[PDB]
């Protein structure tokens, strides 16, 4: 019955742990010990964007590194021109509890979702010049946490009912379901080639999925609490996570285990968002203590602070050309650092 | 093209300043515990009540998006200890630490609560009612710091007078917040 299956599961976990341990030939700290440190990374606020009445839960850069979208909990979706701080669009939502937003890589669409369990797609390039809804996707039994466009016709959404899904926007129907988690799925990150993605959940584990076959390939367990953020390394062979234990960790897909830990004894608040610089040398991470920190991803040494917000930092992103960083926060202000 | 962008920004800003007026003059309420949106108006002031019945049983992630709500309406009828524990976890949350609670005791005994044998307020039902109210108030008045309070009520009828009560406690909440900001309370 159940006892035999539990014993076999314990034996398999022991075997996997032994196989992982046999590959710990060295550590990342030893290899990168003779590398010159980065120095001191000082950034200054360039722009401050003020149009939101309530707290901001999400943001996302456009692929041209100039336009970005932001979502706030007053029920508004605003598209900014970061260069001139002008507003291009302002979209009202049917639900005021919006928890995520995405920008299509072609720039023609925009998505959002939240506590209403629905992903809504908005057509920016209207023939008539007015932004109106294009499709509503309804197949989840829990709040929506993240969404990411694969192309103009596919989107991957993660939800609080412990599942992810791949959608078909034209027909508005689910294509595949990824069912392996045991808690709310909080984030996801697409690989650069968009053939795999990772997801972190509230069971303190992250999984690597394959889009084309819809299976789970690897499971990573290093954290001690819920995982709030996740991001891919630029070459797509590693990823970084941030959880509620005030630590960030770097995992490697080929070694199938954890490499580095980014923690300090003065930090006792959870991480809400992580991101990477263009070369993968810096690791940006937003915290609950109202400011972001810059880490040296190769040496695990803090190299800067981004302290300009008056409340919890909820979102964080770096442009595709790596020329600016945008951070939103619960005080309803976006700031662009450089 | 800069003129057209400036004009579009002007229209957006004009609409935003008009929407901010409606947003700030409305009071949003959460109705967890027991019994989606509902817009009702009492004495020319609009209220906006939400009920979150369509989710799962894990509350620690979607509860922190209700941190700017004016009040939380908690309806509570060992089913009592679970309600007490939920109240104690809501009260001490890091993000709901300045939210007031309007408590509706919808029910209107020593084996599960042994402290009842030595509690002094048919008078027996009033003693039981005030025991339960005192348990909830003993949780609330222990870690407040003065930024939120609890307003308990007894509700059992067809609820003909349950809407004026929320009005009255939402007025007291704002009056106390302003009096405390002016260093007067």
């Amino acid at each position, epitope marked *: 019955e159940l006892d035999q299956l*539990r014993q076999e599961a314990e034996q398999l*976990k022991n075997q996997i742990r032994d196989a992982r341990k046999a590959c710990a030939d060295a550590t990342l700290s030893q290899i990168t010990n003779n590398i010159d440190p980065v120095g001191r990374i000082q950034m200054r606020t360039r722009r401050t964007l003020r149009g939101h009445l309530a707290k901001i839960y999400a943001m996302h850069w456009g692929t041209d590194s100039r336009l970005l979208v932001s979502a706030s909990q007053d029920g508004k979706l605003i598209i900014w021109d970061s260069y001139t701080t002008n507003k291009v669009h302002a979209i009202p939502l049917r639900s005021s509890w919006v928890m995520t937003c995405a920008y299509a890589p072609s720039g023609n669409y925009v998505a959002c979702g939240g506590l209403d369990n629905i992903c809504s797609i908005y057509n920016l390039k209207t023939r008539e010049g007015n932004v109106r809804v294009s499709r509503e996707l309804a197949g989840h039994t829990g709040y929506l946490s993240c969404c990411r466009f694969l192309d103009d016709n596919q989107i991957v959404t993660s939800s609080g009912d412990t599942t992810c899904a791949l959608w078909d926007i034209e027909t508005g129907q689910q294509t595949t379901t990824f069912t392996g988690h*045991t*808690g709310d799925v909080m984030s996801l990150s697409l690989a650069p080639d968009t053939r795999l993605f990772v997801s972190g959940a*509230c*069971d*303190a584990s992250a999984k690597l999925w394959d889009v084309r076959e819809g299976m789970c390939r690897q499971t990573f*367990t290093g954290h*001690e*609490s*819920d995982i709030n953020a996740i991001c891919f390394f630029p070459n797509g062979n590693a990823f970084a996570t941030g959880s*509620d*234990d005030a630590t960030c960790r770097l995992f490697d897909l080929r070694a199938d285990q954890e490499l580095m830990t980014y923690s300090h004894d003065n930090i*006792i608040c*959870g991480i809400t968002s992580v991101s990477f610089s263009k070369s993968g040398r810096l690791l940006l991470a937003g915290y609950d203590d109202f400011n972001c920190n810059v880490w040296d991803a190769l040496k695990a040494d803090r190299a800067g602070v981004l302290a300009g917000h008056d409340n919890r930092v909820s979102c964080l992103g770096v442009t595709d050309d790596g020329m600016a960083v945008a951070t939103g926060s619960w005080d309803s202000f976006l700031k662009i650092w450089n | 093209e800069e003129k057209a962008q400036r004009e579009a920004n002007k229209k957006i800003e004009k609409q935003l300043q008009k929407d901010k007026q409606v947003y700030r003059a409305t009071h949003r309420l959460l109705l967890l515990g027991a019994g989606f949106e509902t817009k009702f108006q009492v004495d020319k002031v609009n209220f906006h009540m939400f009920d979150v019945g369509g989710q799962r*049983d*894990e*509350r*620690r992630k979607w*509860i922190q998006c209700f941190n700017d709500v004016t009040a939380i309406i908690f309806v509570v009828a*060992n089913r009592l*200890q*679970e309600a007490l*524990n939920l109240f*104690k*976890s*809501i009260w*001490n*949350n*890091r993000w709901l630490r300045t939210i007031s609670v309007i408590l509706f005791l919808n029910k209107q005994i020593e*084996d*599960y*609560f*042994p*402290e009842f044998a030595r509690y002094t307020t048919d008078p027996r039902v009033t003693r039981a009612k005030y025991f339960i109210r005192d348990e909830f108030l003993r949780i609330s008045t222990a*870690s407040g710091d003065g930024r939120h309070y609890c307003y308990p009520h007894f509700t059992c009828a067809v609820d003909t007078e349950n809407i004026r009560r929320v009005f009255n406690d939402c007025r007291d909440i704002i009056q106390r917040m302003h009096l405390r900001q002016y260093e007067l309370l």
Partner: nanobody
Amino acid sequence: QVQLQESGGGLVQPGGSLRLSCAASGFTFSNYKMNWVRQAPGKGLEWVSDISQSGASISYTGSVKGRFTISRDNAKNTLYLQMNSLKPEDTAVYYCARCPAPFTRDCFDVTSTTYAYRGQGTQVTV
């Protein structure tokens, strides 16, 4: 990997005494508040006791107040529950839960159907 393994228990006569144990690994035991949760056969999960990060603050449910004692050992990473003066009602499966996040004063969702930071349980019969 956060693992909590409970041991101890079995069958006792009414008025007997047991001592449940919970060995923790995969996390720093000192920064979290731990609890005990039970599930009687036929009903849902019921909260029983909890203890603070240092052992200063302790709470019990009404039905077990006076005859259950909870204590923790931060050096050995163990959590104990002392059950004396047992009653025929106390037969259940006892779980060893944990607050979701460190340093917080609130335990959320500990008695949920699918909670990821609690053990597999030990059967106690009276």
